[PDB]
Point group: D2
Chain length 258, copies 4
């Protein structure tokens, strides 16, 4: 029925692990055929090896236009079509705002904001040229809704993703192309493992005291899983969401309400 | 599946027509057994007659605590259980702010805000007594996000639904109970058909010109249908939305982005 | 100066004590002549007596249209004019959401939401009749932006003030009338003193531990004063805010950012 | 008065013309001594000649750390102090989203986001080294709140300013440093004059049809002047705004309500 993705062809950037790998598995379960584009091709291959409908693994660096152009064309050729882009790749570093370096400012913006711009822009050109009712889902963040201390540069780059998402949605809507983002909470991935260590170091706490504090900040009372985000991305990709565009959907267990 | 409602027991207030009827039908199609509570029990039984998984129709006036309490108990008894509430009943009148009467202020607040309060409160008491991981979806409005001219009292009452939703969601979260709302845009039902002719008069326009304006204000390029909303209500009821609570989900065709 | 209110005629509802009393004193200091309409006229008379520019105290119950109509006319007649309304009167009770009584629901909505509706509606009728560049500032709350546990009914009533404010602002803007609201944080008045007791009992804490928690939740690191709110109300009344209408200005010391 | 800026030492980036020059003039009128830092140092000298309290003109390119560091030190030395930064420099280009170039992507982010980051970060270092209760006001945009078609890249960069502002505010509040931003609507400057010609060409309209459309979207019913923004910046800089930080204050004439 209306949540079904049978026959559709999807690309997921940053799909080798964490949230992106969960997105790839959820799209596949819902009936899609999935290409994963990532820095880490061998992990991408291992995810694909477990998919029902097959799929494809390609190397990409989302910071570079020429890499995104080539990886997307390669994926599209392999898939035999293109209906859906999940632009999920992202990074962070943690620093007091007064100490943020230009190198880490650029690192955060070029993956998180420019990475989404390039994948989205190139996807829309392909949708328009094939006359496809394409769909996009971007992975933003809680930090796209509320600026986070020690992550002031990461917050700025995730606000940028959400603004991009809204403006692109307005331009794409008369073409019947939808564009939304999800804003996850405290998701237990390798990113969380890093950030609890960084926060613990900066605050003079233990890493597990820091992870306990995340849970205590979450009304639903548990740490978030990649799968909590992935099932929402499937909804946003599907015809159940046909009258929804330019949204930043919170998946945070009650931390943020919009 | 994670989008399905197989075996769930649901109550829909205001389920006899328009958005609420489409909600009852969507819940049923997803696998739920549905009780409809409405002022118009004959129209309610008519919707129930076409459902796949059975169902039940009961009389209710959502403005009155004794009525809500008796209807809810009767519906639960008939269902053999209770997992889901969709509090959808609602009304409007259009009028210049300077001319709003106390009678129409009360009409809007008593059905829209008080009606959601009473059905939500009594539902939560039932969920808690049974240790049920209960779910609520309230029908709010685009007018809960942006104040609308000629609907100042209507806007206030819908903002109230949204405020109630967030606060209740914060209290119910540690009890494993979720509470969200949907904010529909311009929906083709008898509320719209009423509204458009009266809006035209007040604005010194023709009714086809007013309708045409709603279309051009919608990025996705069409009038909204009750099914556009009902499918989003199914997702919010389902385990795919298990990590989402206290939200106001826009279903407006891109008119509003949050 | 563009912040000067010299020669202007103001009505403050709820101006007898706390925030309202601070608002009346700040408007007066900025050059206005101020009438205070309050349920406690003895206290209102004491505030008015100490004002630099004259003024008038009148008894009002903002829950009742006949009271608001009569008190507003009496104040306007005494002032010899009418330029500015600050509708500040408000109440609260605290209760778990599943225990909220109909009486306390009505108590909160009739004062907070209806009281603002009546005062604003009647003010606009006066402004329009005399071709006045009128201004309204409403006192909403932090709980108009974020649902507060134990204050679910209070939250819904304050969300309603904010929704009313936006819709009325859209209708009045073509007529040279502005309408905004302020959203205060944890302000040290009699309301706070009552609430910290109720909250301590409900949460099993001490009253001062509850107050300490408010402070720890506030980035600027101190409890709020009525004067912190009053000076922003002066701004919103003034010609410096001439291009601002329909806003909810947060005054919370960084607790909420919009 | 609480709106007085007597004795305070202010730096304005992008103060040579438009909104920035209006800000510089308004701060000086309020009692501040003003240094203007701009790409056009001859235009900054023109503005300083009309200030009551004297002032200083210094060349800066806000895209380059070395330039910002040097200009700010020069300004602070000239002023004999440093209490207030208004980071106002900004640029735009217009383009359909599918045609946006990497060059103009970089142009928008480097001035608008990075320019604010650099001036803000360096200012906080100086405030902290001197134990100063510093204040910052950033010039964001309506496009920091709503994604704008043809300005998708410009929107993203301005959302970035707003997120940066929130996160920095959270870090700076315990040090008694305030950080807010303003979000102007359709302001009559050379940027507007440029944008109406570009927009008219991309849409197949006249420039005066485009202008008329901005006005008809504005509830106050007129095009905005730079002074409508500058007087709000004076408020945000002053002790009247002492309990306000991390906000995006709309100055749009009712276009956007938050
Ligand atoms: N974990 C959280 O709490 C959390 C919260 C909110 C948002 N997010 C966001 O969700 C997304 C996924 O994060 P995650 O937690 O799963 O992190 P992760 O580090 O586990 O996964 C990141 C993936 O993106 C890929 N990647 C990184 N840079 C790339 C580049 N230049 N080109 C191509 N691929 C690249 C990595 O190889 C990896 O497969 C990111 O956009 C992140 O900002 C995470
Ligand atoms: N249609 C729109 O344009 C639109 C837009 C935004 C929000 N909404 C909201 O969506 C919901 C449904 O709107 P609709 O257009 O389908 O309206 P409708 O009038 O077609 O149906 C409303 C249903 O609520 C019931 N109802 C009314 N008062 C009741 C009471 N006191 N007790 C029990 N039942 C009562 C009616 O009998 C009816 O079945 C409402 O909450 C409405 O405010 C509608
Ligand atoms: N104290 C806080 O922490 C806080 C926070 C957010 C919002 N507020 C809001 O600020 C406003 C003032 O609160 P306060 O703390 O100064 O409270 P308070 O209890 O000290 O004063 C309320 C004032 O309103 C008047 N009032 C009450 N009912 C009235 C009626 N029916 N008619 C006319 N006057 C009536 C009272 O006589 C009193 O003068 C209220 O609207 C309140 O909801 C307070
Ligand atoms: N005009 C509007 O309608 C509008 C609306 C929203 C936001 N804004 C924002 O307001 C601010 C000013 O806009 P304006 O309309 O006055 O524009 P403008 O083009 O008139 O002036 C911009 C000023 O910034 C300076 N500048 C540009 N690049 C610089 C650099 N690299 N280093 C130092 N100085 C530089 C210019 O020399 C100029 O003095 C910008 O941040 C803009 O994005 C304007």
């Amino acid at each position: 029925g209306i949540f079904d993705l049978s026959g559709r062809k999807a690309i997921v950037t940053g799909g080798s692990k964490g949230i992106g790998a969960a997105i790839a598995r959820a799209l596949d379960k819902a009936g899609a055929t999935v290409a994963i584009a990532d820095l880490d091709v061998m992990a991408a291959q291992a995810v694909v090896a477990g998919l029902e409908n097959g799929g494809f693994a390609v190397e990409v660096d989302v910071t570079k236009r020429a890499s995104v152009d080539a990886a997307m064309q390669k994926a599209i050729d392999a898939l035999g079509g293109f209906d859906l882009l999940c632009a999920n790749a992202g990074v962070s570093t943690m620093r007091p705002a007064v100490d943020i370096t230009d190198e880490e400012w650029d690192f955060n913006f070029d993956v998180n904001a420019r990475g989404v711009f390039l994948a989205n822009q190139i996807a829309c050109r392909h949708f328009l040229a094939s006359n496809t009712k394409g769909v996009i889902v971007n992975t933003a963040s809680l930090a796209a809704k509320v600026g986070a201390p020690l992550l002031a540069h990461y917050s700025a780059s995730k606000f940028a993703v959400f603004g991009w998402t809204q403006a692109l949605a307005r331009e794409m809507a008369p073409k019947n192309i939808r564009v939304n983002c999800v804003c996850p909470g405290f998701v237990k991935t390798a990113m969380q493992e890093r950030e609890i260590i960084w926060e613990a170091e900066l605050r003079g706490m233990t890493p597990e005291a820091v992870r306990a504090e995340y849970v205590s900040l979450t009304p639903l009372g548990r740490i978030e899983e990649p799968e909590d985000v992935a099932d929402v991305v499937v909804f946003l990709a599907s015809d159940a969401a046909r009258f929804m565009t330019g949204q930043g959907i919170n998946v945070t267990g009650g931390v943020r309400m919009d």
